[PDB]
Design an enzyme around this catalytic site. Sequence first.
Site, short mmCIF file in Angstrom:
data_model
loop_
_atom_site.label_atom_id
_atom_site.label_comp_id
_atom_site.label_asym_id
_atom_site.label_seq_id
_atom_site.Cartn_x
_atom_site.Cartn_y
_atom_site.Cartn_z
N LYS A 14 19.59 1.37 4.56
CA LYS A 14 19.30 1.89 3.19
C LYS A 14 19.75 3.24 2.76
CE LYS A 14 16.42 -1.20 1.07
NZ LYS A 14 15.34 -1.88 1.74
N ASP A 74 8.38 0.62 1.59
CA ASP A 74 7.76 -0.02 2.74
C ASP A 74 8.28 0.62 4.02
OD1 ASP A 74 5.87 -2.17 1.97
OD2 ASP A 74 7.62 -3.09 0.96
#
Lengths: 365, 375
Positions: free
Chosen positions: B67, B108
């Site tokens: 990410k 998350d």
Amino acid sequence: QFNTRRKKYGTSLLNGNVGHEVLAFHKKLPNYAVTPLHNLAHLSQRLGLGSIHIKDESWRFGLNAFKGLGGSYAVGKYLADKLQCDINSKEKIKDCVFVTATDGNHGRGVAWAAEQLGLKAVVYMPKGSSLIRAENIRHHGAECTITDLNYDDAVRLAHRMAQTKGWVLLQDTAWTGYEEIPTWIMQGYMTLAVEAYEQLAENSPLPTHLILQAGVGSFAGSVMGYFVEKMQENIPNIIVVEPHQANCLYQSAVMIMAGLACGEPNIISWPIIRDNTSCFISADDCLAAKGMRISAAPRPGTDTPFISGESGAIGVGLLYELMNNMHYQDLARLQLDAAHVLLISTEGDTSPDIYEDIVWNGRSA
Amino acid sequence: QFNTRRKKYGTSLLNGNVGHEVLAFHKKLPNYAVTPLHNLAHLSQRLGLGSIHIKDESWRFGLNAFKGLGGSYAVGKYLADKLQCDIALNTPEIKEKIKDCVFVTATDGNHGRGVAWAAEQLGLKAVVYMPLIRAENIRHHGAECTITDLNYDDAVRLAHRMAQTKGWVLLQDTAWTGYEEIPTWIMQGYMTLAVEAYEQLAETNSPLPTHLILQAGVGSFAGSVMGYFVEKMQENIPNIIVVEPHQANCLYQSAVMDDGQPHCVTIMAGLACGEPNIISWPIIRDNTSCFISADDCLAAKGMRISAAPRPGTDTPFISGESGAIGVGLLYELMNNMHYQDLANRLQLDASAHVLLISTEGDTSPDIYEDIVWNG
């Protein structure tokens, strides 16, 4: 779930002359080679232990299990005795037919030895035995039949057939009056211990602990017998483990692991096990499944990954739980701390389907 | 359990100039390196497939997940736009002009870590809300991190409210009315892993993908990756399969509704999102061939497969809960007889060359060991 039972009664047939005879014999055999002894140093750190070594018998003789050491030696000794001559060196032994029961590895070993000598071998397996294990016995040219009997009745059948047929019973358990061959089988197993002990010396600390799995006790007797003889003055801490459902040695001491699933202890190995075991453990199947996955999946950087089957991996599985599940820190009494542990992985993926189902799909039962 | 939904509506932002800008940018960054592309040839044989390649993003930037590619590029582009210039490594007298920038997000775990890491590189502050080791790892970049008592979507709302009320820069990987530029950049930044993978296949004379299996939370990652591959393979656009967890299957559900629009739903933590990203939706809708919903045990399976190839053979690697769903699904597809039909329909056979992306490693080591060792 680990059930504990330490041995109150704790306190020769595996001597160095037998050792030399047996090793001399195995070295002359096809595909003899020292099997690997894996040093699981990274796992040893992760668990707080000095050292973990695992003897990988999935390589033994190309048979995916250790048992051939026994069957071969016992067959050799039987024939040497029929021919009245020393283990040292067909018309006189043409009618020799070996017969046994097996959950798979023993029979394979006997079938393989028979095949080497062009002799016939007849094998009976219990109800529920995996088909691939039978196939693999048949591929040595042996006759193999999955019976409708449990293991012990299947041993009975092999016995009745030796008696009524004149075949040579080549079974790896003993009872009163059938002892010589069983003794030789036990003795033949000692090569893996001799190799392991030498592999450690040639500058690794020797074992403080042995964790040994048991069906009838022959393998464990052989291995611990040897190590006791060789380390007479600092005999290591010996833990014997059985499945919950087939815990005869545990039970004797109180009074899916297919290879360990035996109800009647071997009477020749019992005294060695009684006199030398420090603690008997009964274990849930998931610990065996765990051990297979641990062996297969060390972290990429680190310990050597290897193939260890249902009856072969119960050692690391018990060890991991012992050092990791908090419910057992007390038990871990067993003196497991930053302890040099020898384990033996007695078989590889003897049924590939079951192995994949455990290691990839996470079956734990 | 696999649920199926093939796409009726199947039939630019990920173009090569963006590709070059983004890669030009990532290459200047600390610890940039092409991540491995594992060729699972032995597994490919065992399943009856041409080839399986898995892009291993557990290595990316030392962050154990892909990410950062997005967060970094989006942070760069934001700062470039604040300083009005076309994109690094700054002058401290120009640090004066960007000293008050504060990034805020919900995560998350992986997205936040990426943002926290980029902020740390620039000595900027970052504030992170989550719905324990994942939080610690965010704090170690010098970011503020707080485990909320809210679900993921309400946590995204909180980050939004805080940006609005505090003047912080919302750095979120999904989208709102008036908030599309940064999300777009995030999507765009992800494309570097695709550019790398495509080049790694060509430069080893490996067949290019017939199939892409791409996991989805909000769809940004899948949009980015399939977007790139469709652009690059315009004439033989591969078969694209998108997979979500049963409990968070919004794109699946969106496709079931068949009105052209995204639709909300009310172990794979990274995929657990209810609201599809409106910027990636059209790419997904226009290019996905089949939407799959999957049981958690397939993710667990995939983690064990990835970790435990047979000793001789494929390279063993660390693939986490949201990263291993691909091989898990694939194994079941090719091995569970109840799905031979689906597999045949999907054209998975010895002619199919499948690209998968392992999006994270062991982002929680405890969970990972519990799955891979204990089942």
